[PDB]
């Protein structure tokens, strides 16, 4: 139920090999939690959530227990109140969990963030964060305590929070200004070079460079061999493929085709291997005579129009553009519904005027193009009052010519102020909703972008080829971010602040 | 080039005239309305250069394969894509009617690719900065209001 690479420790080979020849248990309240949470005792729960230490990890692994139920009851064509109740169940311990994070940040604020990244070790060895994430629980992470944990989780060991960005784009640009930089408390290059948000600008001035050589070989013209800046451009993307590929391989689970599966979950993995796939025909396709050289240069401004559209995901790391970016991704799905109705209207009267103006015309496939051509640049501001209607020494008159202005006036009335005024209606009215949810869900994965950018080598996809070769070295033969080992005095510290926390919180609530 | 420069300062002197207008009753805090707007204006128009550029380079690229390295390149990147989106679409200017002239290879996508992004320029980003602007507008002018007060 709790997931792939949790390990409960009921399975361990010191329970097993205690339970071959059969004790206590060090702490009881959470086997009985996990027990009235799996039978469906809501009440007991509560009851033994208040006890014991670790409260916080025990309402967490009963809100992903008790969602991970419902779903199985869901799929297993229960009597679907099952579901009802065990939902119920889940929102009431995330709503717990929340509420005590609250308490706690509010009480302390040092010792909050210390209690939500130390190790847990009776629960497969995972923090606050990872089980909160692993249950889905967007409140408990877009929370304040956690986003500043965060925060100082993605500045790294550097002390710079007035005015960032430049000053590392400063330090990436002149080494000789990273010495002159105050740290947190030879050795202090590997420190710079390690953030996160370091190679985040790595990343993203290669990127740029990139960008600016994909630019200059598509407007110049070609020859028969690649010049530099093709050999540049296509090592960066061969590189950037094997670091895919080195992604997939590096995955959680065990299998080839579970690990893909779980890999092609985020579009844009999917549309990256999309992307690099087609550069490769388009490469292989341009190393030929004239005709595959063009088709070659044709994939190649396809390809630039893809990479052009994927900064939005580098522009994503900002505080005011992420959430701008998800709601047109909402936006795009209203406004898809929208064109349906609009497509009907333009190639209804499309055809009208076709078929009314043209009464000789052989069976070409040319008789597709003016269908959508002219009644699609029609609402764009393009009107013409001799391309359509022409005025008919003088030309003959086709029958039935006087009805295709009436028929235009009727369609651009009811496709400029009708259709596109509802869609500024709907956008409008639907607002507010998106907006939050937008919010929410760029705090939620702020997470996984300082993750995924702490497992990065530190070099660029450019001259990534050096790290990968260390790797087969390293191969032959998370002091922080992710962990934080603390020894026992910190442990009973850490438990008894806690248990004052929980009690303070229950005595607040009740009074 | 000192007439150049004055014709260009001028604008300047034209503009300040908001600050004279500032004194009126109605009129100071529509001026600092507009002067939130525009912070809005820049956040929602630095995606709309994005997609301009990357259409004008497509345009560019497919249309015209046999052009020397020159800085008029940088020009038709932006000028057409800006030009196209107020109004002034044109079906000759772009994808032309290749005795009838050569038609260079790929010359069928451009249309598909001018469609696509007049969709998703003129419909969605302007619409969308449109309810950005409605539904943060009565905090605006609270705040506009108290400042000019
Ligand atoms: C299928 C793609 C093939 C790519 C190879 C050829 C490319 C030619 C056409 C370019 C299409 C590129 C669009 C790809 C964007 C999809 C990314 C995605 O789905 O992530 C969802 C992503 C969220 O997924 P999650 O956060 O990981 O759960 O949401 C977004 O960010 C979508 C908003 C950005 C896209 C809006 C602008 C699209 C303009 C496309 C119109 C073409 C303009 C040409 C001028
Ligand atoms: C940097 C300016 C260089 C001037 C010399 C060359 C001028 C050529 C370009 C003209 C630029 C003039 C704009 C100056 C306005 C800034 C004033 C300011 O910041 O006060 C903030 C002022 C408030 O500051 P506070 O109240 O004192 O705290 O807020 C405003 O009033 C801004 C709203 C008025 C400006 C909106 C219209 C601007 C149009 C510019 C587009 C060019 C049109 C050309 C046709
Ligand atoms: C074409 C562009 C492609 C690359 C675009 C790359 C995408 C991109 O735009 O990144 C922006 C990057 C992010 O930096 P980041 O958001 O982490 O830094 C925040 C920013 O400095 C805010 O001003 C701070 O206060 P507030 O929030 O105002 O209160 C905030 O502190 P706090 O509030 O959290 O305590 C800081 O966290 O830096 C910039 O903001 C502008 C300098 C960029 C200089 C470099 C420009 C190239
Ligand atoms: C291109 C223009 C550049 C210069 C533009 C200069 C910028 C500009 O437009 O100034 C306007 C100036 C300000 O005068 P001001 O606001 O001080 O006078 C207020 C005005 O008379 C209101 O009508 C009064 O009642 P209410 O508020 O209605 O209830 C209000 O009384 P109260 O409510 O406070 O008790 C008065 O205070 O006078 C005018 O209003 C129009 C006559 C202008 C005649 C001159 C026209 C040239
Ligand atoms: C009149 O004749 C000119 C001649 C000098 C010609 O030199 C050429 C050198 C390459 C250069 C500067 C030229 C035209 C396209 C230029 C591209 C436009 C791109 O725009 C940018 C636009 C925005 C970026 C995001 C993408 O790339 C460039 C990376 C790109 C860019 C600036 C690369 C540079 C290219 C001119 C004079 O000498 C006697
Ligand atoms: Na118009």
New binding site residues.
């Given amino acids: 139920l709790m997931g792939g690479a949790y390990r409960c420790n009921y399975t361990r080979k010191r329970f097993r090999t205690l339970y071959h020849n059969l004790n206590h248990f060090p702490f009881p309240f959470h086997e009985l939690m996990v027990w009235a949470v799996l039978m469906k005792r809501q009440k007991m729960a509560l009851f033994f959530w208040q006890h014991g230490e670790e409260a916080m990890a025990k309402a967490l692994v009963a809100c992903k227990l008790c969602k991970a139920m419902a779903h199985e009851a869901s799929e297993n064509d229960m009597v679907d109140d099952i579901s009802q109740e065990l939902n119920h169940n889940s929102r009431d311990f995330g709503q717990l969990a929340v509420e005590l994070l609250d308490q706690s940040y509010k009480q302390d604020e040092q010792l909050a963030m210390k209690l939500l990244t130390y190790e847990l070790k009776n629960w497969s060895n995972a923090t606050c964060l990872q089980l909160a994430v692993a249950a889905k629980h967007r409140d408990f992470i877009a929370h304040t305590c956690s986003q500043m944990l965060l925060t100082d989780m993605w500045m790294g060991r550097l002390r710079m929070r007035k005015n960032s960005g430049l000053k590392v784009i400063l330090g990436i640009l002149l080494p000789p200004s990273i010495l002159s930089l105050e740290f947190k408390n030879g050795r202090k290059i590997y420190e710079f070079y390690n953030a996160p948000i370091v190679k985040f600008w790595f990343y993203t001035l290669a990127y740029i460079g990139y960008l600016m050589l994909f630019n200059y070989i598509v407007l110049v013209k070609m020859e028969r061999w690649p010049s530099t800046q093709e050999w540049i451009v296509i090592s960066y993307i061969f590189t950037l493929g094997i670091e895919k590929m080195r992604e997939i391989l590096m995955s959680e689970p065990g299998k080839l085709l579970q690990k893909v599966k779980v890999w092609l979950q985020?579009?844009?993995n999917?549309?990256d291997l999309?992307?690099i796939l087609?550069f490769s025909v388009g490469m292989i396709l341009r190393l030929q005579d004239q005709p595959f050289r063009s088709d070659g240069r044709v994939i190649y401004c396809?390809?630039i129009?893809?990479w052009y559209?994927?900064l939005?995901?580098i522009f994503?790391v900002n505080k005011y553009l992420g959430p701008y970016?998800?709601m047109?991704?909402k936006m795009?799905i209203d406004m898809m519904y929208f064109v349906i109705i609009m497509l009907v209207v333009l190639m209804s009267f499309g055809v009208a005027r076709q078929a009314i103006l043209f009464p000789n015309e052989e069976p070409s496939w040319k008789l597709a193009k003016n269908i959508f051509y002219m009644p699609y640049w029609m609402i764009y501001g393009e009107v013409f009052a001799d391309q359509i209607d022409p005025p008919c020494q003088l030309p003959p008159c086709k029958t039935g010519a006087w009805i295709v202005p009436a028929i235009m006036a009727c369609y651009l009335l009811v496709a400029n102020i009708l259709l596109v005024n509802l869609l500024i209606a709907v956008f409008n009215n639907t607002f507010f909703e998106v907006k939050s949810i937008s919010n929410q869900?760029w705090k939620f994965?702020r997470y996984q972008l300082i993750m995924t950018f702490h497992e990065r080598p530190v070099l660029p996809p450019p001259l990534i080829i050096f790290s990968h070769m260390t790797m087969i070295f390293q191969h032959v033969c998370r002091d922080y971010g992710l962990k934080l080992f603390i020894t026992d005095d910190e442990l009973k510290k850490v438990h008894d602040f806690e248990e004052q926390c929980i009690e303070e919180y229950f005595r607040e609530k009740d009074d």
């Fill in positions: 985020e579009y844009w999917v549309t999309i992307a087609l396809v390809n129009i893809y559209i994927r939005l995901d994503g970016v998800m047109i991704g795009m869900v994965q």
